[PDB]
Symmetry: C2
Subunit: 730 residues, 2 copies
């Protein structure tokens, strides 16, 4: 990737600053040009790429620097002497290694590279290894304790004892009640192959990695590491076996589970800092199932889960800054970067000032959802799609070929556990104009930021001015930010929300506003977030539902904010309470048509179908060739669809590959309302008045907006949306 980057914020209002951070592998400086993005789907059968060049609002040329991406989580303890004394050195931890086949993985190390002094305790398929620095002249001392370690809890340690002149390296299985508990040690004569360190041997202490030139990132859980300077007053030594004058450090990971800090409990207070956001709020060895909430039982959660592909905050220097001029209208923009024929875009949004709308409509860019899906390496970037990317001139870089940009919460880590965090402080290839997600046999295969530009393009063509706010903005400002608008429109797929963003949308309905839910599968998953950890989103896929992975029992509560994660249904807030329909069926990326219930034309809101002949409509579009496709929502009175709901149309004839949303099932033959599951395979367009003054219009299909521009913006789907927004702006 010749040039890429990211921004610190994804939105800013008048007078606010966005910092852009670029990494470029060219020897020449790069150019940045401000553009407004109009249409981002490069399918020739569609409107194609469309920008408004705004080079005179902002343009620059800036020096190029190759900034690196370094995945893998670990903890650093800084400002510490080299551990050890003339009596010796002891260090250990309780561990659960989840992926020993991936090579040397360091539990704990302290390594002064220039002086070749220090220690390292690693695990691998060969067992437990101690590496001791031997000075300028000699290769490192290395002691292996051979053992076959499984994905289970172990105590591991090493002890250097000068008095008896021995090095001990040992591992013991924590649960003694199993058939064959592992207990091995290796004893080796010390023989002045080690001596007490000098003040200049000092170096940082790492947990989870080794810094001897950063490598050997650990996979799995680590709990209660400690370091001692003397013998205690065969079994594994632990922090409690020592008098506190021998303890160099004993870290208890249960303290500060919503922070990046690891606390030392000795009077030394040698605290440390986690890098690249490993997973806290996970079970530790004391967990027995009587406690499920880390907030009231921290001792059952005294572990951290490290992953050699964790990625959060690249730390890239800022190359240029941008302040929104008070005259620049609210909208979807990007900084176009250029070097040596290569392009990238840094997308961002200009947010209207609070209470000072610039248009009657406001669009919500579903950045929480974009971030949850960021850099989803789907394993689908094959020959046909790689070739399709060039023919259409689409964005060239896919996460499948570029694993250095990290994973999406829809991926698994290298140890097979679910990816619970997604950072926006890294290049987000999936949030790029012209990016293709699927090799769509019948359309463009576009999603999220790119699919949403179908709507923004259609709005501008049909003469609707609109402002833009993001999920972060609703998080910051609440319902007050939406209140001034005659209508709020969502993207194609607002899957991910916090209670604050749900509350903003609800409070907007209560203010009397109109809500146009123009997507499918909205309001499904909770995310967690925190002021302490900006730029990170947390997803825990609890209980059930349609999910790329399952959270483990007892790890259902978010680390960042302490809230119960998973499906919004599992926090008593169904989609149908917000928008009258809810996720009911999922299939492949293919669309179908709607059939008007013409009974609707008489009933309230049926005038919305004025100038749509029927009975069917919408059998076309840039997303799978059909206005009702991919993921579908339908009414359910038992989940809170209001009694005054007017079902205006219902989709039919999807392929057999469409199936029911698991969380709507009591069994494979019965839904929660005790219907057959096949009645879930349908998208229902509904309209209803909220009783607050305004109304709701919901389509319940992710591909609905992919039909808007069909046959040069003249089609039944375009007529329907014009009708809705004309109605909503009276």
């Amino acid at each position: 990737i010749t040039i890429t980057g990211y921004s610190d914020v994804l939105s800013a209002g008048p007078g606010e600053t966005v910092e852009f951070k670029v990494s470029s592998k060219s020897p020449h400086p790069f150019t940045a040009e401000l553009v407004r993005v109009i249409h981002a789907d490069p399918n020739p059968a569609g409107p194609g790429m469309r920008f408004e060049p705004l080079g005179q609002v902002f343009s620059g040329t800036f020096a190029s620097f190759d900034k690196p991406l370094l995945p893998g989580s670990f903890a650093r303890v800084s400002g510490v002497p080299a551990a050890g004394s003339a009596a010796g050195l002891v260090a250990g931890a309780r561990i659960r290694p989840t992926a020993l086949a991936r090579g040397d993985q360091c539990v704990m190390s302290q390594w002064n590279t220039a002086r070749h002094a220090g220690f390292a305790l690693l695990v691998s398929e060969r067992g437990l290894e101690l590496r001791l620095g031997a000075g300028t002249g000699e290769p490192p001392v290395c002691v292996l304790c051979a053992a076959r370690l499984e994905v289970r809890w172990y105590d591991v340690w090493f002890a250097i004892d000068t008095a008896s002149n021995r090095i001990e390296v040992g591992v013991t299985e924590v649960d003694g009640s199993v058939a064959a508990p592992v207990r091995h040690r290796t004893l080796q004569m010390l023989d002045a192959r080690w001596r007490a360190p000098h003040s200049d041997d000092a170096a940082d202490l790492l947990i989870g990695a080794l810094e001897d030139g950063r490598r050997a990132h650990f996979n799995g859980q680590i709990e209660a590491p400690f370091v001692a300077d003397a013998l205690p007053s065969y079994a594994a030594p632990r922090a409690s076996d020592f008098s506190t004058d021998a303890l160099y450090a004993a870290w208890d990971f249960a303290r500060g589970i919503d922070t990046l800090k690891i606390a030392d409990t000795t009077p030394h207070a040698r605290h440390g800092t986690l890098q690249n956001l490993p997973t806290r709020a996970v079970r530790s060895s004391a967990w027995n199932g009587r406690e499920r909430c880390w907030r009231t039982a921290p001792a059952h959660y005294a572990a951290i889960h490290f992953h050699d592909d964790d990625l959060h905050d690249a730390g890239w220097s800022t190359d240029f800054a941008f302040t929104v001029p008070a005259t620049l209208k609210s909208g979807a923009y990007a900084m176009r970067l250029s070097v040596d024929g290569a392009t990238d875009y840094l997308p961002f949004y200009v947010r209207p000032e609070l209470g000072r709308p610039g248009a009657p409509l406001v669009f919500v860019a579903a950045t929480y959802t974009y971030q949850a899906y960021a850099n989803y390496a789907r394993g689908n970037f094959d020959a046909a799609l790689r070739d399709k990317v060039g023919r259409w001139g689409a964005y060239p870089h896919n996460p499948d070929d570029h694993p250095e940009v990290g994973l999406a919460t829809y991926n698994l880590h290298s140890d097979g556990s679910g990816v619970m965090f997604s950072s926006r402080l890294r290049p987000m290839l999936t949030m790029r104009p012209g990016f293709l997600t699927f090799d769509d046999s019948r359309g463009s295969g576009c999603r999220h930021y790119i699919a949403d530009s179908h709507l923004l393009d259609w709005l501008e063509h049909e003469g609707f001015s609109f402002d833009v706010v993001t999920d972060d903005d609703l998080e910051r400002f609440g319902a007050a930010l939406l209140e001034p608008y005659a209508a709020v429109l969502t993207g194609t797929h607002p899957e991910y929300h916090t209670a604050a963003t749900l509350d903003a949308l609800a409070g907007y309905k209560r203010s009397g506003g109109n809500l146009a839910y123009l997507g499918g599968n909205g309001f499904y998953w909770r995310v967690g977030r925190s002021e302490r950890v900006p730029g990170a989103l947390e997803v825990r896929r609890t209980e059930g539902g349609v999910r790329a992975w399952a959270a483990e029992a007892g790890e259902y509560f978010h680390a960042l904010d302490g809230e119960y994660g998973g499906l919004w249904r599992s926090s008593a807030r169904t989609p149908q309470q917000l928008v009258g329909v809810g996720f009911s069926s999922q299939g492949p990326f293919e669309g179908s048509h709607y059939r008007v219930l013409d009974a609707a034309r008489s009933q309230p809101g049926g005038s919305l179908l004025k100038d749509i002949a029927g009975p069917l409509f919408g059998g076309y579009g840039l997303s799978g060739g059909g206005a009702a496709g991919f993921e579908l929502d339908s009414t359910e009175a038992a989940d809170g669809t209001p009694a005054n709901v007017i079902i205006l149309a219902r989709s039919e004839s999807h392929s057999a590959a469409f199936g029911p949303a698991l969380d709507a099932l009591l069994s494979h033959t019965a839904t929660r309302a005790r219907k057959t599951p096949d009645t879930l395979i349908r998208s229902e367009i509904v309209y209803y008045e909220t009783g607050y003054g305004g109304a709701v219009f919901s389509v319940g299909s992710i591909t609905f907006c992919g039909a808007l521009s069909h046959n040069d913006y003249r089609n039944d789907v375009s007529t329907l949306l014009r009708n809705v927004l004309i109605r909503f702006s009276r």
Copy 2:
């Protein structure tokens, strides 16, 4: 009409222990009780038919018949209290969430001296909120209606009698003021000496949830009732506490049957028929999910007009186990006027004093969870089949007076979380048929388990019997003396204690024979505080007759996290190597031997089984592999040394995957297609502790044992296993 039925206080007793039998008999003649040992309880003409050993010379009696009633519907009784009110008047109210207003008058709170026509009652209905005041011996009661259309939401309800201003007020206000059209209604009526301050002789019990005139059982949640002696609803916090007659906080004692009064009057009460505690109250906002650490979010109780726990029937006779009566499955045959019933119980061996090499576990937790399951399938054809086969004559579908199963919904649509064993349990009767089985007997649980006990006796295997309740009490020590432990056809429901007894038994070096399907799936809650009650909350997902509400996942009885054992980090495969993977209709199919299996260890078990198929027959759905199926899953803990000896094939299309094993409708947790779940796998493996495990992973496996007079491949297979396990 059920002429004679009854139940026992306990379902098992060891030497020197007593079982009390409680009978209701509608005959004017006395009934006889006779001890029998149950051999085979399946009345299918094509099978071994009913089979008992009469033990009338061990115990027989004759007893007077008494018609004892069944009275469903939960409520709270506060007794030993004066009649509420003062010369200034009377105020009473509560926060409620009514779940079924169409079912008629439902009493929030009442105190009614019937002889004196004195007291009050506040009720809700589709017509609104009604006050009834006693008016004295000569006159019918005063009634004040406040008309309103109430939905399933939280409301404050009240009435206030104020003599100074000569007004009666009845009112209801919707708790959530932020909704579009919040309900606020009241009715004002002039008092005019139509009510007067109570006298000491007007005293009577104060009820919450029903009226004693017992009728008008309430459906829904009640929170913070109280009594004191523009406009807003009065609440307990509005009163000086010496004007407060009582204010109950349901958050205290959530794991008890007691409701606490917070005034110095301490007018506590006792819940009847086991209403549902540990449920959300009005303050619940989603930040708390555990009642044990956030009681203020759970200060409501959910009443149901069909709750039923503890009939309170008097004991008619008792039986003490003689040291000479061997451990086994017995029953008390009741007899009067041509009518028969059976009261089943078990004789449990003494701890540490085995009487046989084998011990069988009667899965009484599973029986109880399914007790009196009214399936809606007792139609002409099955009613006709029941008479022809001479089967047990009474079905829950015809007798709602015996209450529901945890597989039913209450009349308000909420899940049935509790099942009492202190009531007639029609489904645990010899000869009771559950299904109209086109290919067999349609038998389940206690009756299906007797397929196995009959086969054991035929083949010369002596065996002792313990129940789930026994493992709860005694643990692995009760199992240790036996060379093998055998399960029933379907040990679905378990506690941490019963799982631990079986696991600890494996670690002691024992042999385990899992002869069923869908075992070790659901958690139950229980407590010594409430003997005879079992609790089920169907949390998260899985194949479930109903879904628990978010935030109500912890048991009231024991504070434990309910639902699937998977959701408490204990898969079936950790215990028996296979786990629930497919569910279908009551139909069985055959197994196919895995050709590798005969070579590696445990392959001798297939000795003298031709193959490659076997077991395409049986009294349960016509096949040894049917109904609910278990299979291996390495990701769920199937031990690496597991030997898959056979695998079922050719189940009907109606068979589908276990929901909790799915990440989506096209992928399992191990990322395979769901169709690979549709299979029963018989496995064998060594535990590493000295003994081995044999699991069949099929509910209908033992319905094949007696096929062709006990000579058949399934019978050969089980015989091989048990001789191996008893060497």
